Amino acid sequence: SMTSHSWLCDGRLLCLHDPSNKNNWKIFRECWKQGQPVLVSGVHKKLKSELWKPEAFSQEFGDQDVDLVNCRNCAIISDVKVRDFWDGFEIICKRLRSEDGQPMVLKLKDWPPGEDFRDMMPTRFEDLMENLPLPEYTKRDGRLNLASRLPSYFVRPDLGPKMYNAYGLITAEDRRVGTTNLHLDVSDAVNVMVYVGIPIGEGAHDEEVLKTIDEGDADEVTKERIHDHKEKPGALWHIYAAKDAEKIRELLRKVGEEQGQENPPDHDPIHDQSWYLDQTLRKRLYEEYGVQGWAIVQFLGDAVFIPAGAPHQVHNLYSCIKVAEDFVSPEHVKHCFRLT
Ligand SMILES: COc1ccc(C2=NCC[C@H]3SCC[C@H]23)cc1
Numbered sequence: 001s002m003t004s005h006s007w008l009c010d011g012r013l014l015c016l017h018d019p020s021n022k023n024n025w026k027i028f029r030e031c032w033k034q035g036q037p038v039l040v041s042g043v044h045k046k047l048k049s050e051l052w053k054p055e056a057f058s059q060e061f062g063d064q065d066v067d068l069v070n071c072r073n074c075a076i077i078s079d080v081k082v083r084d085f086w087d088g089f090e091i092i093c094k095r096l097r098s099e100d101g102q103p104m105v106l107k108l109k110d111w112p113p114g115e116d117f118r119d120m121m122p123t124r125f126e127d128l129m130e131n132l133p134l135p136e137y138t139k140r141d142g143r144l145n146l147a148s149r150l151p152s153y154f155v156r157p158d159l160g161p162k163m164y165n166a167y168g169l170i171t172a173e174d175r176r177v178g179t180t181n182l183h184l185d186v187s188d189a190v191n192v193m194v195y196v197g198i199p200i201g202e203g204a205h206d207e208e209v210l211k212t213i214d215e216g217d218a219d220e221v222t223k224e225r226i227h228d229h230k231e232k233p234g235a236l237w238h239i240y241a242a243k244d245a246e247k248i249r250e251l252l253r254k255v256g257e258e259q260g261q262e263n264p265p266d267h268d269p270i271h272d273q274s275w276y277l278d279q280t281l282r283k284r285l286y287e288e289y290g291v292q293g294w295a296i297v298q299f300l301g302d303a304v305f306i307p308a309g310a311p312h313q314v315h316n317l318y319s320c321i322k323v324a325e326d327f328v329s330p331e332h333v334k335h336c337f338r339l340t
Pocket residue numbers: 002003004005018021023024025026027
């Protein structure tokens with residue numbers, strides 16, 4: 001039967017089932033006030049699916065110049081055509097190759113660039129902004145979004161949305177690397193999975209995806225979304241409570257020292273955005289510092305709500321298109337204040 005919601009992460013994560021229900025705030029707001037992330041499923045069924053295909057992005061924008069990152073080693077590939085990224089999104093035999101002759105796992109850096117999403121893609125902007133869940137929080141002018149209402153004493157978010165495009169990580173060695181490294185934002189954000197590309201050529205790659213989710217510490221109910229409902233998994237997230245940020249900084253200073261980095265005792269490993277917490281570092285964070293996170297698998301059409309100040313990292317299981325919007329909820333406005 002259809003239900004308002006369910007629980008993931010053994011009861012620690014709210015999952016709302018109906019992205020447009022006017023009642024969602026009645027369940028959403030107690031979880032949000034406690035500093036928890038929230039998941040909303042089914043946003044893909046509200047969107048115009050033809051606007052979110054990699055082939056259309058290549059056809060319409062393919063001649064623009066961009067940089068890419070190699071996700072395996074962080075090397076920058078400077079000044080290539082955006083079609084060189086899109087045409088390899090799902091077809092492995094079209095991907096740029098590293099010197100070892102392997103196809104590369106690539107991330108498209110800063111595209112569309114800065115605040116230009118709305119100007120470059122006005123029909124995509126309309127389709128997304130009209131279908132965001134919890135609209136009193138997430139719309140630029142929503143009644144519970146203080147972004148446009150705050151003085152300079154607060155760090156205000158840039159005009160969004162922002163698009164995040166990257167290939168899926170593939171091998172056993174790829175399990176220890178991030179698509180986006182551990183970091184925190186001073187605003188709240190909603191991140192929507194608008195497209196998941198399951199590739200072909202090296203197509204039969206279903207089992208390393210399961211071992212990644214398993215080793216990622218995903219709950220049994222999350223694993224049933226694959227096996228029972230056949231939904232498409234895009235990305236594995238780890239998110240940590242804002243209150244646990246300094247304990248995470250202490251772990252990464254200790255590990256940085258063990259690994260022979262030479263770092264002043266006050267430097268900020270989270271702001272550096274240079275770490276991915278693999279199975280080993282997550283277990284150590286738990287055992288030695290008493291810190292537990294939320295392991296979240298974001299499927300096609302899932303919206304992930306990330307609280308201000310919450311450290312988080314992202315690991316693409318397949319090729320993903322994500323679109324994110326920043327907002328300032330009254331619950332978390334303390335995290336963007338410029339004094340004390
Ligand atoms: C947050 O409050 C909510 C209230 C009701 C819903 C429903 N959406 C479509 C189908 C029905 S059947 C049972 C309740 C369902 C969802 C959320």
